[PDB]
Motif scaffolding. Structure first.
Motif, PDB file in Angstrom:
ATOM      1  N   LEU A  16       0.873  -1.202   0.000  1.00  0.00           N
ATOM      2  CA  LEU A  16       0.000   0.000   0.000  1.00  0.00           C
ATOM      3  C   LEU A  16       0.898   1.236   0.000  1.00  0.00           C
ATOM      4  O   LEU A  16       1.920   1.205   0.704  1.00  0.00           O
ATOM      5  CB  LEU A  16      -0.870  -0.019   1.259  1.00  0.00           C
ATOM      6  CG  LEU A  16      -2.010  -1.036   1.281  1.00  0.00           C
ATOM      7  CD1 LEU A  16      -2.953  -0.733   2.435  1.00  0.00           C
ATOM      8  CD2 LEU A  16      -2.779  -1.046  -0.025  1.00  0.00           C
ATOM      9  N   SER A  17       0.541   2.281  -0.746  1.00  0.00           N
ATOM     10  CA  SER A  17       1.348   3.527  -0.838  1.00  0.00           C
ATOM     11  C   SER A  17       1.016   4.467   0.330  1.00  0.00           C
ATOM     12  O   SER A  17       1.890   5.270   0.686  1.00  0.00           O
ATOM     13  CB  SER A  17       1.175   4.191  -2.171  1.00  0.00           C
ATOM     14  OG  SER A  17       1.419   3.268  -3.225  1.00  0.00           O
ATOM     15  N   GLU A  18      -0.173   4.348   0.932  1.00  0.00           N
ATOM     16  CA  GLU A  18      -0.601   5.181   2.094  1.00  0.00           C
ATOM     17  C   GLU A  18       0.000   4.589   3.378  1.00  0.00           C
ATOM     18  O   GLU A  18      -0.534   3.575   3.857  1.00  0.00           O
ATOM     19  CB  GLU A  18      -2.129   5.257   2.198  1.00  0.00           C
ATOM     20  CG  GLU A  18      -2.823   5.722   0.927  1.00  0.00           C
ATOM     21  CD  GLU A  18      -2.973   4.660  -0.148  1.00  0.00           C
ATOM     22  OE1 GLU A  18      -3.273   3.503   0.201  1.00  0.00           O
ATOM     23  OE2 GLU A  18      -2.773   4.986  -1.330  1.00  0.00           O
ATOM     24  N   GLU A  19       1.071   5.192   3.908  1.00  0.00           N
ATOM     25  CA  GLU A  19       1.805   4.691   5.105  1.00  0.00           C
ATOM     26  C   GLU A  19       2.672   5.801   5.713  1.00  0.00           C
ATOM     27  O   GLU A  19       3.402   6.464   4.953  1.00  0.00           O
ATOM     28  CB  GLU A  19       2.702   3.501   4.742  1.00  0.00           C
ATOM     29  CG  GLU A  19       3.312   2.813   5.953  1.00  0.00           C
ATOM     30  CD  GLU A  19       4.093   1.536   5.679  1.00  0.00           C
ATOM     31  OE1 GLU A  19       4.446   1.284   4.503  1.00  0.00           O
ATOM     32  OE2 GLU A  19       4.359   0.798   6.651  1.00  0.00           O
ATOM     33  N   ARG A  20       2.619   5.964   7.037  1.00  0.00           N
ATOM     34  CA  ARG A  20       3.595   6.773   7.816  1.00  0.00           C
ATOM     35  C   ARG A  20       4.533   5.815   8.559  1.00  0.00           C
ATOM     36  O   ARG A  20       4.146   4.648   8.762  1.00  0.00           O
ATOM     37  CB  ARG A  20       2.863   7.734   8.755  1.00  0.00           C
ATOM     38  CG  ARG A  20       1.962   8.725   8.033  1.00  0.00           C
ATOM     39  CD  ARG A  20       1.729   9.998   8.837  1.00  0.00           C
ATOM     40  NE  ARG A  20       0.368  10.516   8.722  1.00  0.00           N
ATOM     41  CZ  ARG A  20      -0.159  11.079   7.630  1.00  0.00           C
ATOM     42  NH1 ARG A  20       0.548  11.203   6.516  1.00  0.00           N
ATOM     43  NH2 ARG A  20      -1.410  11.511   7.655  1.00  0.00           N
ATOM     44  N   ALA A  21       5.726   6.286   8.931  1.00  0.00           N
ATOM     45  CA  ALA A  21       6.801   5.473   9.549  1.00  0.00           C
ATOM     46  C   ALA A  21       6.879   5.715  11.062  1.00  0.00           C
ATOM     47  O   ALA A  21       7.704   5.033  11.716  1.00  0.00           O
ATOM     48  CB  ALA A  21       8.119   5.775   8.884  1.00  0.00           C
TER      49      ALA A  21
END
Length: 526
Positions: free
Chosen positions: A349-354
Motif C-alpha cells: 500500500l502507498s498510504e503509510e507513515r513510519a
C-alpha cells in the motif's frame, strides 16, 4: 485513421475468489447542444423516454457552461438498459442525441474495503502531465480512470494492461487479475464489531505475512471518487473530525505503550542486560539514580518481586524503567529498529507513515539538543517520543512469533499471468538475533500469561477458550486514552496474529472483548 482501444482493467478477488473490484459497462445519454434547437423542448420530450428529472437538466445546463462549448455533454447518467432500449427505439425522433457506453470500475462492498482496495479516479490535467514525464501516456490514451488509493494505486502497472490500436485491428491485452490474502467475511465482521468506534485492526497469518483483514474506521464510499468526486463533498470529508480519509492501520501514528514490552524483553535478554533469573523489587515507583525524579508504576504500591515473566503478565512499568536505563537509548533504539519501529513495514500500500523510534542523532537533528537520561526512561514503556502504526505493531508481533524471522505484511496472494496463478514472493529474508535464542519463547510465554494465568492483565477476556491465546494490552494518551492490544492464537502453532487500537477508548466494547470475538470467529468457524 489509427485511434486507440482501452484495455479492460484486471479484477481484484479475496482468498475465496469473491470479486471486490469489477468492470461494469455504464450507458449515458449525450448530445452536442450546438446540433440541437429548442433544447428546452427536446429536454421536456425526453422526460418520459429515459425518466429525465429536473436534477438531470440542472447538472446538464450547469456542466455545459463549465465544459468547452460544442462538445457532447452527459444528458442523463447513468442509464439502465431499460432506459437505453426505450431511447434506442426513438433514436429516429432525436438526431444529434445518442447513447455512449463506458467501462467504469464498480466496488460492490464500498465502505467495507475503501482503505485496502482504494479506488480509481478520473485522470485530471495534473495526472496527464505525470504520465507524460514517465513516458507511458500512449498506454493511457484511451483510459479515463487511474488508481489513486490502496491496491488500485499500488498495483496500477499490473491491473492496467496493454492498450490496443485499430487502423480504420491490434487487440488490447487486459490487465492481469489480482487475488488478495484478505477474507471479505472477516473484514465485514470486524467492521460490524467496530461500528461507532474510530479504530484500526490488522489481522495477519503469521506463517505467510498475508493480511486477512485491514480496517480503518470510520470509512467512506469509494464510489464517489470513481464518478469524479464533487469538490463540495470532498471538503465534507476533509472537515469530518473523525478524519475518515486517514488509513489508521498504516498512517495512524500512536504511542505503542504497553505492547512494546515483549520486544524490549527479547532485546534486553539478547544484550545480556537481563536473564530469565534477573529479579528486582517494585515498591510501585522507580527513581532515576542520584536525582529525586520518581517514575510511577500503574499499580500504586507495586508488583513486589519481578522477573521478565511476571513483569509481562502484570505489565509492570518499574521492571522496564530499569531495563531501559541499563540498555540505554543507543542499543534500545537499534534493537527496536530491527523489529521495524521507525521503519516502513513493506506492505503493498502507498498510504503509510513510519512514526518515530527516537535516537540521539534524531533529537540533535530535530531539536538541536543532547539526549538526557530522563528521555531514555519513558521509551522503556513505549511512551517516549516513540510512535508506531498498527501495521508496524502487527509486523513486530509476527517477527516475535517467527523467532526473528521477519515476514513482510502484504495483501497480494497471487497474479493470473497468462491464465496461470504466480504467487506473492517475499523479497525480505532478514533474521533478528539467533532463531533458537529461547528469549523469543520467554517473551511469548509472558504474553501467554497476560491471557490465561490468574495474574494476567487480560485474563477476563480469554476464559473458556478451547485454544490458548497469547496477548499484550496497552494504554496510550494524547479527550480520552487510546486502547491497544496485540494477540495471537493457537499459542503452540500460531495461525492468526491481531493488532487492534481504539482511538480515545473507542465506542464502549473493550479491545480485549473485540480481540476475543475476532479470535473465536476465525478459529471456532464462528
Amino acid at each position: 485513421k489509427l485511434v486507440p482501444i482501452a484495455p479492460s482493467r484486471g479484477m481484484i478477488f479475496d482468498r475465496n475468489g469473491t470479486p471486490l473490484a469489477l468492470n461494469r459497462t455504464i450507458y449515458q445519454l449525450e448530445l452536442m447542444p450546438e446540433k440541437i434547437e429548442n433544447l428546452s423542448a427536446t429536454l421536456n420530450a425526453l422526460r418520459p423516454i429515459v425518466d429525465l428529472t429536473d436534477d438531470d437538466i440542472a447538472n446538464f445546463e450547469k456542466e455545459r457552461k463549465r465544459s468547452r462549448r460544442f462538445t457532447s455533454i452527459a444528458v442523463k447518467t447513468p442509464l439502465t438498459e431499460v432506459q437505453v432500449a426505450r431511447f434506442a427505439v426513438n433514436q429516429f425522433r432525436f438526431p444529434g442525441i445518442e447513447v455512449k457506453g463506458y467501462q467504469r470500475r464498480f466496488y460492490p462492498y464500498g465502505s467495507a474495503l475503501t482503505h485496502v482496495i482504494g479506488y480509481v479516479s478520473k485522470i485530471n490535467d495534473k495526472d496527464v502531465e505525470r504520465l507524460d514525464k514517465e513516458g507511458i501516456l500512449p498506454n493511457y490514451a484511451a483510459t479515463h480512470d487511474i488508481g489513486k488509493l490502496g491496491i488500485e494505486r499500488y498495483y496500477e502497472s499490473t491491473l492496467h494492461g496493454k492498450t490496443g490500436y485499430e487502423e480504420v485491428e491490434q487487440p488490447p491485452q487486459a490487465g492481469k487479475d489480482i487475488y488478495l490474502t484478505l477474507d471479505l467475511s472477516l473484514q465485514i465482521y470486524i467492521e460490524k464489531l467496530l461500528s461507532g468506534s474510530r479504530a484500526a485492526v490488522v489481522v495477519t497469518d503469521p506463517r505467510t505475512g498475508g493480511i486477512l483483514a485491514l480496517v480503518s474506521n470510520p470509512s467512506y464510499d469509494p464510489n464517489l471518487f470513481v464518478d469524479g468526486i464533487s469538490n463540495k463533498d470532498y471538503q465534507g470529508l476533509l472537515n469530518d473530525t473523525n478524519r475518515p480519509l486517514i488509513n489508521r492501520a498504516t498512517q495512524g501514528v500512536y504511542p505503542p505503550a504497553s505492547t512494546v514490552k515483549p520486544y524490549i524483553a527479547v532485546s534486553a535478554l539478547s544484550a545480556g542486560v537481563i536473564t530469565k533469573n534477573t529479579s528486582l523489587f517494585d515498591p510501585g515507583w522507580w527513581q532515576l539514580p542520584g536525582s529525586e525524579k520518581r517514575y510511577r508504576d500503574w499499580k500504586k504500591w507495586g508488583h513486589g518481586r519481578l522477573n521478565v515473566t511476571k513483569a509481562l503478565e502484570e505489565s509492570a512499568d518499574t521492571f522496564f524503567y530499569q531495563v531501559a536505563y541499563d540498555m540505554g537509548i543507543d542499543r534500545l533504539s537499534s534493537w527496536m529498529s530491527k523489529f521495524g519501529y521507525g521503519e516502513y513495514t513493506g506492505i503493498d500500500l502507498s498510504e503509510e507513515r513510519a512514526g518515530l523510534m527516537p535516537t540521539r542523532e534524531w533529537k540533535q537533528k530535530r531539536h538541536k539538543k543532547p539526549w538526557y537520561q530522563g528521555d531514555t526512561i519513558p521509551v522503556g514503556i513505549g511512551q517516549g517520543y516513540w510512535t508506531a502504526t498498527p501495521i508496524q505493531m502487527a509486523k513486530s508481533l509476527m517477527t516475535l512469533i517467527n523467532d526473528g524471522t521477519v515476514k513482510t505484511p502484504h495483501l497480494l496472494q497471487s497474479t493470473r499471468i497468462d491464465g496461470v496463478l504466480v504467487p506473492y514472493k517475499q523479497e525480505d529474508s532478514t533474521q533478528i538475533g539467533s532463531i533458537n535464542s529461547g528469549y523469543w519463547e520467554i517473551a511469548k510465554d509472558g504474553m501467554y500469561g497476560v491471557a490465561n494465568r490468574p495474574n494476567g492483565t487480560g485474563r477476563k477476556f480469554f476464559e473458556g477458550t478451547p485454544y490458548k491465546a497469547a496477548a499484550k494490552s496497552g494504554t496510550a494518551q494524547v479527550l480520552r486514552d487510546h486502547k491497544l492490544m496485540v494477540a495471537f492464537a493457537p499459542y503452540e502453532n500460531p495461525t492468526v496474529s491481531v493488532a487492534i487500537i481504539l482511538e480515545n477508548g473507542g465506542a464502549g466494547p473493550a479491545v480485549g472483548t473485540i480481540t476475543r470475538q475476532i479470535l473465536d470467529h476465525i478459529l471456532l468457524g464462528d
